[PDB]
Write a protein that binds this ligand. Structure first.
Ligand SMILES: [Mg+2]
Ligand SMILES: [Mg+2]
Ligand SMILES: [Mg+2]
Ligand SMILES: [Mg+2]
Ligand SMILES: [Mg+2]
Ligand SMILES: [Mg+2]
Ligand SMILES: [Mg+2]
Ligand SMILES: [Mg+2]
Ligand SMILES: [Mg+2]
Ligand SMILES: [Mg+2]
Ligand SMILES: [Mg+2]
Ligand SMILES: [Mg+2]
Ligand SMILES: [Mg+2]
Ligand SMILES: [Mg+2]
Ligand SMILES: [Mg+2]
Ligand SMILES: [Mg+2]
Ligand SMILES: [Mg+2]
Ligand SMILES: [Mg+2]
Ligand SMILES: [Mg+2]
Ligand SMILES: [Mg+2]
Ligand SMILES: [Mg+2]
Ligand SMILES: [Mg+2]
Ligand SMILES: [Mg+2]
Ligand SMILES: [Mg+2]
Ligand SMILES: [Mg+2]
Ligand SMILES: [Mg+2]
Ligand SMILES: [Mg+2]
Ligand SMILES: [Mg+2]
Ligand SMILES: [Mg+2]
Ligand SMILES: [Mg+2]
Ligand SMILES: [Mg+2]
Ligand SMILES: [Mg+2]
Ligand SMILES: [Mg+2]
Ligand SMILES: [Zn+2]
Lengths: 80, 63, 98, 60, 24, 206, 62
RNA sequence: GGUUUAAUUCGAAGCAACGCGAAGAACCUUACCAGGCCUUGACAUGCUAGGGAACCCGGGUGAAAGCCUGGGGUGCCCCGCGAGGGGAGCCCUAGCACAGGUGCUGCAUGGCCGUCGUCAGCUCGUGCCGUGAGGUGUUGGGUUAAGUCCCGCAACGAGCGCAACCCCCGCCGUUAGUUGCCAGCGGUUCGGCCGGGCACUCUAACGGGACUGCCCGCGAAAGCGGGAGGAAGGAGGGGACGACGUCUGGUCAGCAUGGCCCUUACGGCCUGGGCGACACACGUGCUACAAUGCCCACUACAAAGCGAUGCCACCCGGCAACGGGGAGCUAAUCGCAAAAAGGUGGGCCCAGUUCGGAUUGGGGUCUGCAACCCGACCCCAUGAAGCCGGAAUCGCUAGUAAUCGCGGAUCAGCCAUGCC
């Protein structure tokens, strides 16, 4: 129960960057600050570093997690 | 016109009681002591700030 | 059949200048439909009395717009000529349709 | 508030959803009755000085 | 009552309309 | 806590609005802002004349500013070359063509804004506060008036602990609407803080 | 899809978001309100009964 | 509150802090944290030589800010026939005068607020008393809601308070007829829809109306009890209105403001995070635990409000949120709008239930650049705790409590069950 209508959203500066690295090889690590962006099928492969307000994180990117938003994988707060 | 049916009952009651007196001014004798001529000036009281509801006061602790 | 919706924030100044719009005649030239009451619209603002806390303080302000109608039937041209420079209120406004 | 933080002056706010209010008199960002453009505190001051035409102590 | 979204009472309480409180 | 603005309370009856125009809910906001700018350019530049109040009225685009000063001398200037400069300096902030008028104040000692304004200036010139106030009141009481009252706030005399000084005679009947009590507040920017000067002046009844 | 064939559709549906790096997964694993609630108070229904602990060392009676 | 945290920004403290500042925290707001940057600066008035200077689309890098770079333009005054020299304006670095600071201090302040308390009180002038601080007045006897009035008296008066003057409600009249009608006749596409009139309702300006004025009884008087007439009878009901002071009360984070403090950061801009963290505790609430009830259908009566880059009739698609189309309304005329309890019908039958709607899985809608952190709504499934609550404890004396719905402010949206 979320919200992507007849629009679907992926922040594009990160997208033109990943599709670019789909002309050849996969760049180990991509420095993003946009956790805002949904994951497309074309991201399954290259490990993206989602920020945190504090640290980019090694979010490896399985196909089992496509429809999800990036920030769903870089926990913000620290607990016990 | 206006309000709610139970007040409309009371208001018709005043309406009738008045017509019936301008039809025969003598009727007051067997009509005024019953009270039917008086108009019920009892009306909803305004909502006061810092109250919940005119008089309902918000509940407090520690005293 | 001219239409004149009058309105301002003061009503001492309205009824005393809607009256001055009914200066065609009392009832001897064009009909005159009398200065029409027409309900006022009341905006309210409710302000917490002090700065910083004291929720339960509060103070009410209102700004009320009063509205008149008048309307004159069968507009002779000299009746209109009087709608020129003949006024004194500053806080009264004037819609005109026909 | 911070004189700097009247980048409410920024006519283009980039996105129309970064647009906010601020009291045109004191800067207050938090009770700005949009009719007057004034915050709650300024409104009561101006109301009492009789510089809000038509505005009056209201009781009923 | 007023808490259940899928009822008359409940839809009235929460401003809304829908299957359970038709708009008309 | 206590005590509402004796003006804003009487605003209904015995005292009328400084700016008295009408405007819709898409205009009121703007006219009000510009109306303020005028008071600001006015209260700063006209200090010397000692401006009690500024009436502002509007209509078919035009704006009738009716300034009330004790000494209309200082607003006229070279026989004009000042009331022109200011009706001009208003034409820039107000693109809507202004009309500056000047109103004599017969009796500056019967307008609370000026009386208070008077006291304020002394406190900066380090006058003796207690006397200033007893005096100020007398100057107002000597000029007719049914009653009057003045108040200076805190830090009277550089004194480390803020106080309050008083003085008042005649009747100053605050809770009666049927009054007419001109009120006036003056600020006093001294070397060691700020001080507030409130002035009440009762006169007439109905 | 009813009864059994559903009860383990949902259960295995949760394990999905638990097996990826997902946030809702963490929330499922800790046992804390998945749908973005408050937990400062009032998350009893997700948390189970109250696990009350000692509160002070030098302050009034509360 | 506590604890946690990179940060969980700051304030508020028993009454009188705790649905309080906040009448709208996804970014913004913002004050906090991390990381990328900026410096005469996002804003003000300026002062010396310097290169060029209104300006208009580019490029690289980048999360964005920002940094870097290529390019047509070269105008308006005076001197010169000219190539050119000097210059008003706005753009420009590298320095100075200054900006800026939600950094500190209600333990320097103004302003505004809270509070005792809408309590009936606080004083003053003059006289008199007392060596004096002081007293009398203002104590006493009645009486009032009241230092309200009466009577008394070394006191006679007065001011700030009380009451009255202002507002809203209750009865009536005059002015006023693009809202109102079997009032009265004509027509009906049986809708005040049409002619038509304003009587009535209403709308909203101005007035009348109450005075312990009249009667009976107690009273020295003020007044008390009762009774008529009246819509209303002794303050008819509700507002606004808060004395000298108290709290060294709240607030320098609304705004001022003295002082102290920082000045390639205690200023400034971004992007992301935080303010929403959870083993716990408290306050104020909401929804309940059901039969005087819940569900569905039909049907009846409100008041106050709001509406233009807004309210949206009506039509079509969708289970629906809602999308498409589209009428009217600057609104007493159009719309939000359904009022809801109520009434009539049917169902449920004592059950954790057709009570309760928490939680969770899924599929969607709309707002916004963007809803992971952290939006509201709709639909399907899930259907928790809860059988009326220990010690303790809150509100309310009449259209009150209880209960039922409706509206606004703030606001793209909305965490509103809050507030008015
Ligand atoms: Mg790029
Ligand atoms: Mg009620
Ligand atoms: Mg109060
Ligand atoms: Mg500031
Ligand atoms: Mg906003
Ligand atoms: Mg149910
Ligand atoms: Mg720390
Ligand atoms: Mg502070
Ligand atoms: Mg209280
Ligand atoms: Mg933020
Ligand atoms: Mg030049
Ligand atoms: Mg400075
Ligand atoms: Mg203070
Ligand atoms: Mg009283
Ligand atoms: Mg003695
Ligand atoms: Mg003596
Ligand atoms: Mg005594
Ligand atoms: Mg006595
Ligand atoms: Mg008295
Ligand atoms: Mg009074
Ligand atoms: Mg009448
Ligand atoms: Mg007929
Ligand atoms: Mg008597
Ligand atoms: Mg403090
Ligand atoms: Mg918070
Ligand atoms: Mg607590
Ligand atoms: Mg349909
Ligand atoms: Mg039944
Ligand atoms: Mg019970
Ligand atoms: Mg009582
Ligand atoms: Mg209830
Ligand atoms: Mg809203
Ligand atoms: Mg509501
Ligand atoms: Zn303000």
């Amino acid at each position: 129960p979320r919200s992507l209508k007849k629009g679907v959203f992926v922040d594009d500066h990160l997208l033109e960057k990943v599709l670019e690295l789909n002309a050849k090889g996969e760049k180990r690590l991509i420095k993003t600050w946009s956790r805002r962006s949904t994951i497309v099928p074309e991201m399954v492969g290259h490990t993206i570093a989602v920020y945190n307000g504090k640290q980019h994180v090694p979010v490896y990117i399985t196909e089992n997690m496509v429809g999800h938003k990036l920030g769903e994988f870089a926990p913000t707060r620290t607990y016990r | 016109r206006g309000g709610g049916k139970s007040g409309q009952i009371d208001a018709i009651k005043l309406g009738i009681a008045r017509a019936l007196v301008q039809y025969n001014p003598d009727y007051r004798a067997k009509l005024k002591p019953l009270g039917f001529l008086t108009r019920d000036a009892r009306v909803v009281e305004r909502k006061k700030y810092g109250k919940h509801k005119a008089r309902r006061a918000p509940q407090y602790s520690k005293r | 059949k001219i239409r004149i919706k009058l309105r301002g924030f003061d009503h001492k100044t309205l009824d005393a200048s809607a009256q001055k719009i009914v200066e065609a005649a009392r009832r001897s030239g064009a009909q005159v439909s009398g200065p029409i009451p027409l309900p006022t619209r009341v905006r309210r603002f409710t302000v917490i009395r002090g700065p910083f806390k004291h929720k339960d303080s509060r103070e009410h302000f209102e700004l009320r717009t009063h509205n008149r109608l008048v309307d004159i039937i069968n507009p002779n041209r000299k009746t209109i000529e009087q709608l020129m420079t003949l006024d004194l209120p500053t806080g009264v406004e004037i819609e005109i349709k026909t | 508030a911070r004189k700097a933080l009247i980048e409410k002056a920024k006519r283009t706010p980039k996105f129309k959803v970064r647009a906010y209010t601020r009291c045109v008199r004191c800067g207050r960002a938090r009770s700005v009755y949009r009719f007057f453009g004034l915050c709650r505190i300024c409104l009561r001051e101006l109301a009492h000085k009789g510089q809000l035409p038509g505005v009056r102590k209201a009781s009923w | 009552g007023k808490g259940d979204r899928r009822t008359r009472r409940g839809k009235i309480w929460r401003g809304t309309y829908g299957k359970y409180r038709p708009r008309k | 806590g206590n005590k509402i603005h004796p003006i804003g309370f009487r605003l209904g009856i015995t005292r009328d609005w400084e700016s008295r125009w009408y405007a819709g809910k898409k205009q009121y906001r703007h006219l009000l802002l510009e109306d303020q700018r005028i008071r600001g350019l006015l209260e700063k530049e006209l200090y010397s004349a000692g401006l009690a109040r500024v009436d502002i009225e509007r209509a078919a685009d035009n704006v009738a500013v009716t300034v009330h000063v004790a000494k209309p001398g200082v607003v006229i200037g070279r026989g004009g070359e000042r009331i022109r400069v200011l009706r001009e300096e208003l034409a820039k902030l107000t693109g809507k063509n202004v009309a500056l008028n000047v109103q004599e104040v017969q009796n500056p000692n019967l307008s609370a804004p000026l009386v208070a304004q008077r006291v304020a200036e002394q406190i900066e010139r380090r006058f003796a506060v207690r006397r200033a106030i007893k005096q100020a009141v007398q100057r107002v009481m000597e000029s007719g008036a049914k009653g009057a009252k003045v108040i200076v706030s805190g830090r009277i005399g550089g004194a480390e602990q803020a106080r309050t000084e008083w003085a008042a005679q005649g009747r100053v009947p605050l809770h009666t609407l049927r009054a007419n009590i001109d009120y006036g507040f003056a600020l006093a920017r001294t070397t060691y803080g700020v001080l507030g000067v409130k002035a009440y002046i009762f006169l007439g009844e109905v | 899809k009813l009864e059994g064939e559903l009860r383990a559709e949902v259960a295995a549906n949760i394990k999905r978001l638990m097996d990826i790096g997902c946030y809702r997964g963490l929330r499922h694993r800790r046992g804390l309100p998945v749908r973005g609630q408050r937990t400062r108070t009032n998350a009893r229904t997700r948390k189970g009964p109250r696990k009350t602990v000692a509160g002070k060392k030098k302050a009034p009676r509360k």
